[PDB]
């Protein structure tokens, strides 16, 4: 499903992040929509900076971004992935 992180398995979330990182869309509008969705799901204070403006030494590969999100949500009282 699409409404919250808890509706995504980790693998499904990695799929979303991979699509974003590769700009695998038919328009700039579609990519902006996905990035907005990502920011809304994660609730991370860095927003789209997780994807585009990583902190020095952070892993900005798709699997790196998923790990950053997973760890932050776990450490900050937020619900995790489905399953």
C-alpha distances in angstroms, 50 versus 12, 26, 54, 69, 75? Answer: 18, 23, 5, 9, 17
User: Considering the rule CB under 8 A, would residue 52 count as an interface residue with another protein?
Assistant: yes
Stretch that binds another protein, among 8-16, 42-50, 70-78 (CB under 8 A): 42-50
Rounded Cα distance between 51 and 57, Å, is 13
Q: Which residues contact 2 (CB under 8 A, 6 or more apart)?
A: 37
User: Considering the rule CB under 8 A, would residue 63 count as an interface residue with another protein?
Assistant: no
Choice between 47 and 72, CB closer to another protein: 47
Binding site for another protein (CB under 8 A): 20-23, 25, 28, 31-32, 35-36, 46-49, 51-54, 60-61
């Amino acid at each position: 499903l699409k409404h919250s992180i808890s509706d995504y398995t980790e693998a499904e979330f990695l799929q979303l992040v991979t699509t974003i990182c590769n700009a695998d869309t038919s328009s700039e509008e579609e990519l902006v929509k996905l990035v907005t969705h990502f920011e809304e799901m994660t609730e991370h204070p860095s927003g789209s900076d997780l994807i585009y403006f990583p902190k020095e030494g952070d892993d900005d590969s798709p699997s790196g971004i998923v790990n950053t999100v997973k760890q932050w949500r776990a450490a900050n009282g937020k619900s995790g992935f489905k399953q």
